[PDB]
């Protein structure tokens, strides 16, 4: 980031070490649970990392070995992650395998990455193991690690191109893809983030984002640690239970940067009653980033109208685009500036070119700019491999020192994504994303592959239905079905449930809708957009999820079936 001595460091390990010498008592990370606060300084973070690394070394872990990190959000996850890096080990973070699908995912990650050790908290060695082992991997409770081991740490010779950690992406549920992020990849992107976000020493980051997804890890934890900036955090569970707490904490801690995928702004609008806004002051919040999924004008306008009386300014909104394969940040605008939009015509014909329309012409729709290329971005036709003109839709191809090394132990998939070559032309990351450049700003339009097809091959509908049927929620329900609907230019994950009691009162309905949203988010890392409640026995008898699902999809579309209530995330 800023000071030259830090720019010169060759890994995040040395950045943390040096910060701990220059400013041992500077607050780094704060984690919040309810009204409880725990903070660690740079001196502490460095000492914990050394202690953990010395333990890994004492237990036979070698540079390049993978160490699985099984943690809920919190300071222990962050200590363990740095501790892995200090040992030259490849960190492999995973969500605690609390339910069936999360456990299946963990097993597939273990099989792929073949870690030598797993770290987790003492409580979890009891919950997830029978020398304790988790899925045959020797396990170690982080609490067993004492600070008197710190001085035993032996520095390794970390090279730029060495892999620092694996970040597993969503999708590919059947063969999870572990993106190999090198030490050089990581520092390159951290610098791009610090710079592009105009961070400085007033900056304070707040995050509730999953630390097991790139944005919440690389953006909201590793960047602040790298840049000497406070990270103030809570768990996604805390956010979903009480989204107001996000805005309360931003208020209390005068956070300047905080953000999320687009849905979370709608979730705030939907969940926070006018009277509960009393006490907010969001004037400090100058960069409200919006990335990881399609960015919606309507969402941001709703949020702006809902919070403007409490100091929130629409200019704070900062659309951005990226993916794990490029470490994180690929495009973004200028902080404090108004993001741009374009209005496309209903009819886009077949030329792959963008067809524009007057600012509210019939059937027109708006796309939000994801900002300027920060990594090099080319729009390339995915079939012919010929570059697209501006205002012509093609695949988003990326190149820079932030582009990752491949997928762990998946050589064919790695060639499929990281070896893009332009017809008659460098090597590019092929994102699978479609979009276009207009006046040097990137407009993301969709995915090459049909999202309904993707949901299907990942077994999302069947697995979401399983979750509902196996949660305590099933006690007030009959049968259920989950599916994705494409509905003018957007995709909406839709859940339909029979309810035993068709007179379910408005409060119970609201609670039920929220419980459903939380369940799917936790079990599947997906966001439900629409929930429909219908009477018992309203779905025909069948032993087939597919038949049941097709019936619900078809009769939602008909507008025939009896409906008890509907919930729409993005509607007021």
What are the residues binding ligand 1ZZ (CB under 6 A)? 169-170, 193, 197, 205, 213-215, 219-220, 223, 257, 289, 291-295, 319-324, 328-329, 370, 431, 433, 444
- Between residues 169 and 399, which has the closer beta carbon with respect to ligand 1ZZ? 169
Distance, in Å, from the CA atom of 207 to the CA atom of 219, rounded to the nearest integer, reads: 9
Angle at the Cα of 73 (from 72 to 79), degrees rounded to 5? Answer: 100
Question: Two tokens at 284?
Answer: 């400090």
Q: How far is the CB of 126 from ligand 1ZZ (least distance, A)?
A: 31
CB of 515 to ligand 1ZZ, least distance (A): 25
CB 495 within 8 A of CB 531: yes
Q: Which residue, 404 or 533, is less far from ligand 1ZZ as judged by CB?
A: 404
DSSP state string for 33-45 = ETTEEEEEEHHHH
Tell me how far CA of residue 542 lies from CA of 319, 480, 500, 548, 549, in angstroms: 44, 12, 18, 7, 10
Dist. CA 278–CA 248, nearest whole Å: 10
Nearer to ligand 1ZZ, 88 or 371 (CB): 371
Instruction: Kindly state the smallest distance separating residue 291's Cβ from ligand 1ZZ, in Å.
Output: 3
Q: How far apart are CA 221 and CA 437, in angstroms?
A: 30
Return d(Cα 522, Cα 441) in angstroms, integer. Answer: 34
Nearer to ligand 1ZZ, 134 or 246 (CB): 246
**Which of 57/223 has CB closer to ligand 1ZZ?**
223
Closer to ligand 1ZZ by CB, 448 or 485: give it.
448
The least CB distance from residue 554 to ligand 1ZZ, in Å, is 29
Query: Is 133 or 457 the residue whose CB approaches ligand 1ZZ more closely?
Result: 457
- Cβ of residue 402: shortest distance to ligand 1ZZ, in angstroms? 11
Taking CA atoms, 506 is separated from 475, 479, 512, 513, 564, in Å, by 18, 21, 10, 11, 11
Is 51 or 374 the residue whose CB approaches ligand 1ZZ more closely? 374
CA-to-CA separations, 436 to 60, 183, 389, in angstroms, rounded: 50, 31, 9
* Measured CA distances, 58 to 53, 153, 306, 360 (Å): 8, 9, 54, 66
Smallest distance from ligand 1ZZ to CB 171, Å: 8
In the bound state with ligand 1ZZ, the residue whose beta carbon lies nearer, of 18 and 454, is: 454
Q: Which helix (H) or strand (E) holds 332?
A: strand 329-332
Residue 286 CB partners (closer than 8 Å, separation 6+)? 256, 257, 313, 316, 335, 336
- With CA atoms as reference, report the closest residue to 232 among 206, 193, 270: 206
Residue 526: CB minimum distance to ligand 1ZZ, A: 12
Residue 216 or 243: which CB sits closer to ligand 1ZZ?
A: 216
What DSSP state is assigned to residue 224? H
CA distance 477 to 99: 20
Do 455 and 484 touch, CB atoms closer than 8 A?
Answer: yes
* Closer to ligand 1ZZ by Cβ: residue 55 or 369: 369
Instruction: State the nearest-atom distance from the C-beta of 396 to ligand 1ZZ, in Å.
Output: 8
Q: Minimum Å distance from CB 432 to ligand 1ZZ?
A: 6
CA–CA separation, 256 vs 206, rounded Å?
A: 8
Residue carrying the six token digits 């600012």: 359
In angstroms, give the least distance from the CB of 169 to ligand 1ZZ. 4
**Nearer Cβ to ligand 1ZZ (250/497):** 250
Q: Give the CA count within 13 Å in the CB-facing half-sphere of 32.
A: 20
CB of 330 to ligand 1ZZ, least distance (A): 7
Q: How far is the CB of 218 from ligand 1ZZ (least distance, A)?
A: 7
Cα dihedral across residues 528, 365, 444, 295: positive or negative: negative
465's enclosing H/E stretch is helix 460-470
**Of residues 193 and 232, the one with the C-beta less far from ligand 1ZZ:** 193
Instruction: Specify whether the CB–CB gap between 90 and 65 falls below 8 A.
Output: yes
- Under DSSP, the state recorded for 277 is G
3-state secondary structure of 133: strand
Residue closest to 315 by CA, chosen among 283, 279, 342, 359: 283
Q: What angle do CA 215, 217, 221 make, to 5 degrees?
A: 115
Least distance (Å) from ligand 1ZZ to the CB of residue 37? 21
């Amino acid at each position: 980031s800023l000071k030259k001595e830090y720019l010169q460091c060759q890994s995040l390990v040395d950045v943390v070490r040096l910060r701990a010498l220059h400013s041992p008592n500077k607050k780094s990370c704060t984690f919040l649970n309810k009204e409880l606060e725990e903070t660690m300084t740079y001196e502490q973070l460095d000492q914990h990392a050394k202690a953990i690394a010395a333990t890994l070394q004492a237990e036979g872990a070698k540079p390049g070995d993978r160490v699985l990190l099984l943690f809920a959000p919190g300071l222990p996850l962050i200590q363990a992650f740095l501790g892995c890096l200090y040992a030259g080990c490849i960190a492999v973070p995973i969500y605690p395998p609390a339910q069936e699908k999360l456990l299946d995912k963990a097993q597939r990650i273990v099989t792929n990455s073949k870690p030598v050790i797993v770290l987790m908290i003492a409580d979890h060695i009891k919950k997830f193991t029978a020398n304790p082992k988790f899925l045959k991997i020797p396990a170690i409770a982080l609490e067993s690690i004492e600070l008197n081991r710190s001085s035993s740490w032996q520095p390794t010779s970390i090279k730029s191109n060495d892999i620092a950690f694996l970040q597993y992406t969503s999708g590919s549920t059947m063969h999870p893809k572990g993106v190999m992020v090198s030490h050089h990849n990581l520092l390159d992107n951290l610098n791009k983030i610090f710079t592009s976000f105009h961070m400085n020493d007033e900056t304070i980051i707040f995050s509730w984002l999953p630390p097991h997804h790139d944005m919440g890890l690389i953006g909201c934890i590793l960047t602040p640690i790298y840049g000497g900036i406070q990270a103030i955090m809570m768990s996604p569970f805390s956010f979903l239970q009480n989204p107001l707490s996000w805005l309360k904490h931003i208020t209390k801690y005068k956070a300047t940067i905080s953000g999320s995928p687009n849905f979370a702004y709608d979730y705030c609008v939907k969940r926070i009653r006018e009277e509960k806004k009393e006490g907010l002051d969001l004037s400090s919040w100058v960069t409200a980033f919006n990335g990881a999924e399609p960015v919606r004008e309507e969402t941001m306008e709703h949020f702006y109208q809902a919070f403007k009386e409490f100091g929130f300014r629409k200019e704070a909104f900062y659309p951005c685009y990226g993916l794990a394969e490029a470490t994180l940040l690929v495009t973004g605008g200028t902080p404090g500036s108004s993001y741009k939009t374009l209005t496309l015509a209903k009819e886009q014909f077949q030329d792959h070119r963008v067809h524009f329309a007057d600012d509210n012409s019939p059937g027109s729709y708006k796309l939000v700019s994801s900002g300027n290329p920060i990594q090099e971005v080319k729009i390339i036709d995915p079939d012919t491999l010929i570059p697209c003109d501006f205002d012509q839709v093609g695949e988003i191809w990326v190149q820079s020192n932030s582009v990752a090394k491949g997928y762990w132990n998946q050589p064919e998939e790695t060639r499929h994504a990281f070896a893009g070559k332009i017809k008659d032309d460098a090597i590019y990351l092929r994102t699978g994303d479609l979009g276009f450049l207009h006046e040097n700003e990137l407009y993301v339009t969709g995915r090459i592959k049909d999202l309904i097809i993707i949901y299907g091959k990942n077994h999302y509908p069947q697995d979401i239905e399983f979750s509902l049927m196996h949660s305590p929620l099933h006690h007030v329900l009959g049968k259920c079905a989950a599916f994705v609907i494409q509905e003018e230019h957007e995709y909406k994950l839709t859940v339909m449930c029979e309810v035993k009691n068709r007179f379910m009162d408005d409060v119970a309905q609201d609670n039920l809708f929220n419980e459903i949203f939380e369940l799917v988010y936790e079990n599947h890392q997906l966001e439900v957009h629409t929930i429909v409640l219908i009477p018992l026995k309203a779905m025909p008898h069948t032993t087939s999820g597919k038949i049941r699902r097709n019936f619900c999809r078809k009769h939602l579309l008909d507008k025939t079936l009896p409906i008890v209530a509907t919930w729409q995330l993005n509607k007021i």
